[PDB]
C-alpha cells in the first residue's frame, strides 16, 4: 500500500475464530423403540348339541 516516506507500521489482522462451518448439530437421531400391533381374539366355549 502506498504511503509516507521511511518506516511504516507492521500490522497483521488474521482473525482466529472459525467461520460458519457445517455443524448444523440439531437433527433427530434416536426416537424411542416403538412397535404398533393390531390384535385379535376368538371366543371358544364348549359348543355341543
Amino acid at each position: 500500500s502506498p504511503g509516507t516516506p521511511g518506516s511504516r507500521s507492521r500490522t497483521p489482522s488474521l482473525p482466529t475464530p472459525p467461520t460458519r462451518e457445517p455443524k448444523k448439530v440439531a437433527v433427530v437421531r434416536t426416537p424411542p423403540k416403538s412397535p404398533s400391533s393390531a390384535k385379535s381374539r376368538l371366543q371358544t366355549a364348549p359348543v355341543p348339541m
Binding site: 518506516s7 507500521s9 507492521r10 500490522t11 475464530p17 457445517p22
Partner: protein, 111 residues
C-alpha cells in the same frame, strides 16, 4: 441484566464467583475484581502509536543497540503488538451467529 451491552454475548454468563469466610482486617466485608475486556486495546494502541512516532525518527534508539540489541529484533516487536491489538479486534464488535449446514460447495462441472 442492566448492562448486557458491556458483556461478550458469545461468552454467556461471564462470571466466576469466589467467596471467603474471612474479611480483610478492620472491615467486616470487602471484594476484589478481575476483568478481561477488549476495552484494554487502547493501552497497546497508544503505546504502539508512541513507539512508531519515536521509532520513525529513531529517537534515543542508539542506547538500546548500544547494548547489542538488534534493530531488526526491535522492528518486529512492533508486529507482535499490532497482532495483539488485532487479537482483541477479532472479538471486538463480534456477534452470535446461527448454526447450520454452512459448508461451501462448487458447481456440477468437471474441474
Amino acid at each position: 441484566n442492566k448492562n448486557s451491552s458491556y458483556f461478550v454475548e458469545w461468552i454467556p454468563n461471564n462470571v466466576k464467583t469466589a467467596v471467603c469466610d474471612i474479611p480483610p482486617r478492620g472491615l467486616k466485608m470487602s471484594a476484589t475484581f478481575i476483568g478481561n475486556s477488549t476495552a484494554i486495546q487502547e493501552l497497546f494502541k497508544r503505546i504502539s502509536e508512541q513507539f512508531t512516532a519515536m521509532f520513525r525518527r529513531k529517537a534515543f534508539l542508539h542506547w538500546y543497540t548500544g547494548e547489542g540489541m538488534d534493530e531488526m529484533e526491535f522492528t518486529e516487536a512492533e508486529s507482535n503488538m499490532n497482532d495483539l491489538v488485532s487479537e482483541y479486534q477479532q472479538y471486538q464488535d463480534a456477534t452470535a451467529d446461527e448454526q447450520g449446514e454452512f459448508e461451501e460447495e462448487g458447481e456440477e462441472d468437471e474441474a
